[PDB]
Amino acid sequence: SAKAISEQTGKELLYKFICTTSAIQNRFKYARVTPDTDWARLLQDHPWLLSQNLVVKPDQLIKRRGKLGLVGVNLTLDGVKSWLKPRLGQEATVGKATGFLKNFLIEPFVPHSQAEEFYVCIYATREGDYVLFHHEGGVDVGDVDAKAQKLLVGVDEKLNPEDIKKHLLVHAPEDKKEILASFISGLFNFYEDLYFTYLEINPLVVTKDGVYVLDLAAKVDATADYICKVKWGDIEFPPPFGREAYPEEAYIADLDAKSGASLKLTLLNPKGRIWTMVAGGGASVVYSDTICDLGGVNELANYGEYSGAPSEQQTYDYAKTILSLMTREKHPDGKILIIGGSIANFTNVAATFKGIVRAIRDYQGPLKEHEVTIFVRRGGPNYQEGLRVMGEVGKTTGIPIHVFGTETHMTAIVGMALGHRPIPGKSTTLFSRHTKAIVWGMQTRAVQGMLDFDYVCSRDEPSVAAMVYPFTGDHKQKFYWGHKEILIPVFKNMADAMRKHPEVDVLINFASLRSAYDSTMETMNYAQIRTIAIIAEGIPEALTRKLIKKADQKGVTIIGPATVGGIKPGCFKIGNTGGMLDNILASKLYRPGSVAYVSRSGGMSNELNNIISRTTDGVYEGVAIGGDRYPGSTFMDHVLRYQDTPGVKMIVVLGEIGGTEEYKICRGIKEGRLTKPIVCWCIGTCATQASETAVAKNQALKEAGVFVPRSFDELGEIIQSVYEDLVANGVIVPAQEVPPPTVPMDYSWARELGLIRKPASFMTSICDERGQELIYAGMPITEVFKEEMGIGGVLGLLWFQKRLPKYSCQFIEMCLMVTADHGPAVSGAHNTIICARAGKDLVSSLTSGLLTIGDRFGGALDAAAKMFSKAFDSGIIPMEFVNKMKKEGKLIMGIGHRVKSINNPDMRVQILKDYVRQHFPATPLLDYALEVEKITTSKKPNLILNVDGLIGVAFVDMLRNCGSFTREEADEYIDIGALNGIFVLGRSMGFIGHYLDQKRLKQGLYRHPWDDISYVLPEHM
Amino acid sequence: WARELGLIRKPASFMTSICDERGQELIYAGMPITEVFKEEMGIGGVLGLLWFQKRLPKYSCQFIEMCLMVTADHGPAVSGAHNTIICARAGK
Ligand SMILES: CC(=O)SCCNC(=O)CCNC(=O)[C@H](O)C(C)(C)COP(=O)(O)OP(=O)(O)OC[C@H]1O[C@@H](n2cnc3c(N)ncnc32)[C@H](O)[C@@H]1OP(=O)(O)O
Ligand SMILES: O=C([O-])CC(=O)C(=O)O
Ligand SMILES: O=C([O-])CC(=O)C(=O)O
Structure with missing residues (x-):
């Protein structure tokens, strides 16, 4: 996709990145004025605006300004100011477009004679680059194909300056020949290393002082950004000059860029009655063409x-955006x-229709008020349920909705909505049944679809032999062969995959747009690979041309890029290609037919299978060559392939607007090379070079002898008519229909639409990983952090599933x-130290003590x-x-230190006792325990409450008297084992810190002193 | 019910190849437990079957037992014995 850039940006890129021996003058001398900005700041930041004469022109992608006179030439500062007074900031028109005039480019005027001017243009075609030059300056440059000098330079070819001198400068004046040679060489290098598609400089003022550029236009490959984002800097692409974008149109435009979906909306008549909300670019082209052809062009x-x-x-x-825009003004x-x-x-049809029905139910008011009628047609996975729910809401909300499926033709409904009809060495055999393919990439869904298609087609071996993924090791992927499990090897290199499978001749490259090129070259370095199908969309056109050249030299057939594939x-x-097995079985694509179709985009391919299946014997072969405008295999390369194929009996071709391609079919049929019946229809009329339009192509095909229909609506009808034309003569014999083997439904697919039950184990209630955010108990992680609860708070949420009060959280942190x-x-720390000084990892090391x-x-x-607990809640007094x-004969646990006592407190029991006293509500078991420690510290004085005891009792008393637990909950937690979770957690820090220590001190294996063992082995057993 | 009559597919994880608990008899490699005991292979034989999935010769089984x-x-x-003694001596 080549996008036109503002002439200012091309000017700047030429100034920065041109490289020639000659000197380019007026470097970085340009300015831009908009009605939104004033003059003083621009008048001061560029001090050369008051040095020479200036020229101003509209910098808003306007063509042929010289004939229409929208340029002010040879005018000084106040002159161009007074010229801009009636132009800068309001409605202006050019050609057909009317819109606001936003930009002006201002350049220091260069005094030039009419003979010093020159014309140059470099544009990229499929087989290389054309450079075109005329020496007779001005607009009057005459015919460029005969008197001006052209030069075709191949792809991956270096431009010799001697070639420029010999072939391009034949009629140029001798004085400026040597400077123009270097200038053209540098301009071509600049063209080639920034992936420009079109670069037209007109005119070019070459005086004795040097080279002057005054006006130029550039279209640049917007897909090559990943190669030249550092080189183009912040490149900008201006919209075509026209009317202002409506708020809803801009809303949809900004809502498209936020996701990976393709969301387009452009208004033709804001007061119309026929509104299209259709999926698939080709589908919108077809509906638009049918409505425009069926009298709805003005509506x-x-x-x-x-x-x-x-x-x-x-x-x-x-x-809701598209419906709110049709409820503004009504229509009689x-x-x-x-x-x-x-x-x-x-994509599941049901889910999309659920979104649509929700929107329609929320907007049903004005829709009923404005007397709107909805026609819905769709096909694919679970289209029946979507049609059912659409009809259910049409009966419910009262809006008359007419739902249709794959049995109905696409544009019948728009014929029904308008009331026009009543409302009810390249090889010829690319693929054989012995074909095997190597899939490049982790595309398990596509490979599974291929295997399902292979099984339903009664093939004996899978068509996928191996998969190549450079980012993982060599292993085996588990796939289905109908019911059975099979193992498809996954390789890290292409080389070993190629050697272990020498009979593989197809490579399906699922690489991205920035990794398809080198992978395709490396594949071409293997002679066994006879065809490569490139699925990636967005490869720059220069790299695609290099791919085409190397494929032609190696005899490999490329299907793509930007293609869905061929079936x-x-x-x-x-x-x-074809979709899931629902579409393959619906379109009877499991058995060969006799009709071979070639399409351009992948969106029309499925409809072509549907049409050919429902009107004729069926599809024999179908290839979508890709949406790139340099496809790896043209229409001709496939129509000749079908002509050589004895299996096919008729060929359907579906092109689009642009590109002299079907004229080659016309020349072929008038030459007599193509004899089989060919039906064609180029979509994209949109007439609301003159030979590039779909109408002219359809004509040339019609008078060329190709059975072209008047619209898409009768395409199925005309293919059917050709079907009777070929079965009456007796060349097409319909084959007997044999039922295909059936594959079981996928469990995920059968559960998505919910026809099955499986009981789920692993009930969990402490975390919800799925969804937008992590949820611990019921509060998202953002609410956890916003409420400023610490680690104690997340123990409350994860362990006890409760949002504990602040003092209990701080007490958990304290303990x-x-x-x-x-x-x-x-x-435990002994075990952690022993295992950490034996070379083991943190997990092993610390968990050893954890076990301990x-x-x-x-x-x-x-x-x-x-x-x-059993002492307090049983009555026994202290x-x-x-x-x-x-x-x-048992000791009280929790009472007893070894060295600390009355007078030498424990200092960890005092910090925690003083929090449990100052902050806790009621502490009834810490009181009973601090009375059992009066009775026991009377006995021996070191029989005080140990940290164990204190934490124990104070947690039983925070669990029971804090407000969140109900004394049974708070007694399950004590028994399940939630106080051994506190100890464990605490020790874990210390344990790890003794791993991290003995690893910083680099201590070695510990062999226990044997003098500290005392073996007591038996005498002789 | 839907899988018993086989109208649905679910991918099975956990490929295993060292034991077949289901069916009439335990099967270690492909050789049932009764054949394991009737061929008089010892613990070395069942390491051959479970670990290496092969019916090793008699000297290999006896050498595995020896080592x-x-x-x-x-x-x-x-x-390691120190850690086992420490943890056993802590009542675990
Ligand atoms: C110059 C000269 O020295 S000559 C002087 C001559 N006189 C003497 O020699 C007297 C010196 N000896 C004594 O008086 C001492 O009492 C001794 C050494 C005989 C024993 O004293 P103690 O260490 O207090 O006895 P003991 O170790 O049994 O512990 C006392 C209590 O602590 C209790 N206790 C210990 N640990 C715990 C625990 N974890 N939880 C609850 N209770 C505990 C025991 O139940 C015991 O209870 P009891 O008194 O009801 O049996
Ligand atoms: O098959 C594809 O790759 C395209 C697709 O799923 C869809 O968006 O409908
Ligand atoms: O907490 C325990 O049970 C063991 C302990 O730390 C100590 O040696 O005092």
Whole structure:
């Protein structure tokens, strides 16, 4: 896609990046004035505006300004100011377009004679680049193809300056020959290294001082940005000069760029009654052409798309925008909405119609008020359910909605809505049944579709032999062969895939637009690969021309780029062409037919399969050559291939506007090379070079002898008529219909539309990973951070599933910090240190001590909480608990230090006791426990409440008396084991810190002293 | 029900090739447990079947058993046995 740029941007790029021995004058001498900006700042930032004479021109992509006189030449400052007074900022027109005039380019005027001027133009064609030059200056340059000098330079070819001198400068004046040679060489290099498509400099003032550029136009390959974004800087593409964009049109435009979907909307008549909301660019072209041809040319409101599987929000917004625009002004003859569409490849029709029905139900008021009628036609996955829900809402909201499926032709509904009809060495055999393909990329969906097509076509071997993915190791992917499981090898290099599968002759390159070129070259370096199908869309045209050249030299057939692929029923299917097996079975694409079709875009291919299946025997072969304007295989290269094929009996061709291609078919049939019946119809009339239009092409085909219909509506009718023309003579014999093998429904597909149940295990309630944001209990992660709850808060949410009050969260944090570490001598830290000094990883190392926890190391927390609980809630007063446990011969857990005591407090029990006292509401078990410690510290004085005990009791008392748990919940948590989770968590920090330490100290393997073992082995066993 | 009569497909993960619990008998490689015991292959034989998926010759099975016996223990001072003793001595 070559986009025209503002002449200022081309001027700047020429100034920065030209390279020639001669000197270019007036470098960085230009200015731009808009009605939105004043003059003083521009009059001061460029100090050369008061040095010489100036010339001003409209810099808004306006052609042939010299004949129409929209340029002010040889005028000084106030002269151009007074010239701009009646022009700068209001409605102006040129040719047919009317619109606001926004930009002016101002250039220091160069004194030039009429003989010093020159004409140059470099434009890219399919086979190379044309450079064109005339020496007789001015506008009067005469015919350029005979008197001016042309030069075709090939692709990947270097321009010799001697060739420029010998072939281009034959009639140029001798004085300026040597400077123009270098200038043209530099201009060609500048053209070639910035991927320009069109570069026309007119006129070119070459005086004795040097070279002067005054006016030029440039169209640049917008797809090559990834190569030259650093070179073009901040490139800008101006819209064609015309009327202002409506608020709703700009709304849709900005709503398109936010996603990966294709959303288009352009108004033709804002007060019209026929509105099209159709999926597929070719589909919109077809509906627009049919309505314009069927008398709705003066009433068709707009054209546009919603494609690329738009989201439900995108579809809702697009539908409400398009419906609000038809409810502004009403119409005496009613109003029509046409929700058309091509046959969907894989997108579920039901979901799109759910979005559309939601929008229609929300906008039904004005729609009923304005007396609108909705015609909906669609096909693809689960189109029946979508039509059912559309009819259900048509009966519900009262808006008359007429729903149709694949059985009806595309543009019948627009014939029904308007009331015109009543409303009810290149080879010829690319693919054989022994064909195998290598798929380049992780495209498991496409490969599975190919395998399903192979199985339903009764093939004996899969058509995918191996997959190449450079970003992973060599392994095997598990795929389906009907019911069976098969393993398709995935390789990292192309080389080993090629060697292990020497009989593979097709490569389907699923690479991106910036990786298809080199991959395709590397594939061409293997002689066994006879055809390459390039699916990527957006490869720059120069790289595509290099691909075409190398394919021609190596005899490889390229299908693409920017193609969906080609489908040969019963034999082969490239990637995703045809769609899922619902479309393949609906269009009877599992058995060969006798009609071969060649299309340009991939959106019309599915409709062509539908039409050919429902009107004739069926499709024998169908190839979409791609939407790029340098396709790897033209129409001719495939029509000759079909002519050489004895299997086919008639050929359908569907081209578009632009490109002298079907004239080659005309020359072929008048030459007599093509004899089989050819039906064709070039879509894209849109007449609302003169030979490039679809109407002229259709004519030339009609008088050439090709059965061209008057519109698309009778395309199926004319192919049917050719079908009787060929079966009456007895050359086409309809084959007997054999039922195809059936594949089971996919589980994911059968659950998406919900005809099946599977019970789900792993009930979970602490995190919801899916959706827009992480949800811990019921509050999203953003609300977790905005409410400023810390780690204690997320333990509340994840462990107890409750938004705990602030003091309990801070207490959880506190008891994590006191638990964090207690030295390396203890058993768990010992295990972590031993495993960390044995070369093991953090997980192993720390989890070793993690395991070590539980009973004797680590289990006093719970042991006390569960003891003191059963002591408080059973009535025993503090001193009958001290005495019951003596008698039971057990010790109280939670009571007992070794060195600390009355007078030497524990200092970690004092920080935490003082928070549990100052901040907690009621602490009834910390009181019972601090009374059992009066009875026990009377005995020995070091029998105080240990940190274990305190944390235990204070957590039982925050769980029970805080306000969120209900004393059964708060007693499940104590039993399930949630106090062994606090200890564990705390130790985990310390444990890791003893891994990270013994790893910084680089300590080695620990062999235990043997003097500290005392082997007690038996005598002789 | 829909899979019993086979109108649906679900991809199965967890390819396994060392044991078949389902069916009449346990099958280690392809050789049932009764054949495992009738051919008198020992623990080395079932390492051959489960680990390498092959019915190893008799000397290979006996050598695997031998190298398991020599590896069995090397005292309590070494690091791993130290960790096992520490964790066993903590009541786990
Ligand atoms: C110059 C000279 O020295 S000559 C002086 C001559 N006199 C002496 O020699 C007297 C010196 N000895 C003593 O007085 C001492 O009492 C001793 C050494 C006999 C024993 O004293 P203690 O260490 O207090 O006894 P013990 O170790 O059994 O502990 C006392 C209590 O702590 C309790 N206790 C210990 N740990 C815990 C625990 N974790 N939870 C609850 N209770 C506990 C025990 O149940 C015991 O209870 P009891 O008194 O009801 O049986
Ligand atoms: O088949 C494709 O690649 C295109 C597709 O799914 C869709 O958007 O309908
Ligand atoms: O917490 C435990 O049960 C063990 C411990 O840290 C200590 O040695 O005091």
